[PDB]
């Protein structure tokens, strides 16, 4: 299948990304606490629901929330301010809270069932968010021996995610609060300037700049 691209809501960030985040890929955003990673996730969860000519993929969203940071009210605000019905937008976001890293891994398997269920509806899954990708792995795999073990478990989790992205034409978007290997397709470093600034890592070589607004994010 030909890939799709989901606009972020920011023209600046979209250019940095070549149009938006890609389906059949894992995009990792990483940066310190408060950089805006979860804001970007909320914005994408709305943008993907737009029709293709408006930068969306008429898609549903699966959201694996590991830090209890999903906020329906924020979805409502973003949807309303972009001309969309808040309750309809929320209906197409399927959220599961991951209790620990093992549960988080199982939730990826369960996600495949929902992806199959919606595959031939008018709104197939087009975005799968994991926020935070790494928080449970950080708290559980710690101390001598943990670097190898944690990295192996993460890699396998990411391989499961890559398979869903590639098999079912989905954009996977993951967040990571920050010498280690990484297996995401594209890594985006995000930092706070009221501006937020994004740079592609190990990959346009410039930087994108955007604001957090009532529309999610925008230039």
- For residue 132, whether the previous peptide bond is cis, meaning omega lies within 30 degrees of 0, is yes
What does DSSP say about strands 25-31 and 171-177: parallel, antiparallel, or unpaired? parallel
66 marked ligand binding residue: no
* Terminal C-alpha separation, the chain: 31
In sequence order, what are the beta bridge partners of 199?
A: 189, 207
Question: How remote is the C-alpha of 87 from its chain's centroid?
Answer: 21
32 marked ligand binding residue: yes
135 marked ligand binding residue: no
Decide: helix, strand or coil at residue 61. strand
35 marked ligand binding residue: yes
121 marked ligand binding residue: no
**Buried (b) or exposed (e) across 80-101, using 16+ Cβ within 10 A?**
eebebebeebbebbbebebeeb
Closest Cα partner for 50 from 61, 65, 63, 37?
A: 61
101 marked ligand binding residue: no
Give the separation between CA 39 and CA 208, rounded to whole angstroms.
15
Secondary structure tally for the chain: helices H, strands E: 7, 11
37 marked ligand binding residue: yes
33 marked ligand binding residue: yes
Pair 165, 24: CB distance under 8 Å: yes
For the chain, how many residues are written? 219
Residue list for the binding site for ATP: 31-38
Residue list for the binding site: 31-38
């Amino acid at each position: 299948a030909t890939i799709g691209r989901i606009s972020t809501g920011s023209k600046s960030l979209d250019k940095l990304l070549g149009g938006g985040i890609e389906t059949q890929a894992i995009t990792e955003v990483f940066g310190e606490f408060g950089s805006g990673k979860t804001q970007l996730a909320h914005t994408l969860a709305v943008m993907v629901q737009l029709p293709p000519e408006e930068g969306g993929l008429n898609g549903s969203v699966i959201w694996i929330d590991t830090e209890n940071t999903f906020r329906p009210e924020r979805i409502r605000e973003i949807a309303q301010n972009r001309g969309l019905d808040p309750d309809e937008v929320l209906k197409h976001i399927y959220v599961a809270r991951a209790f620990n890293s093992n549960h988080q891994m199982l939730l990826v398997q369960q996600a495949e069932d929902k992806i199959k269920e919606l595959l031939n509806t008018d709104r197939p899954v087009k975005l799968l968010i994991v926020d935070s990708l790494t928080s449970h792995f950080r708290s559980e795999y710690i101390g001598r021996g943990a670097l190898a073990e944690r990295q192996q478990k993460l890699a396998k989790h990411l391989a499961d995610l890559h398979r869903l992205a590639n098999l079912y034409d989905i954009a996977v978007f993951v967040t990571n609060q920050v010498i280690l290997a990484h297996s995401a397709t594209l890594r985006v470093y995000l930092r706070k300037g009221g501006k937020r600034i994004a740079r592609l890592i190990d990959a346009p070589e410039g930087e994108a700049v955007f604001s957090i607004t009532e529309k999610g994010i925008e230039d």
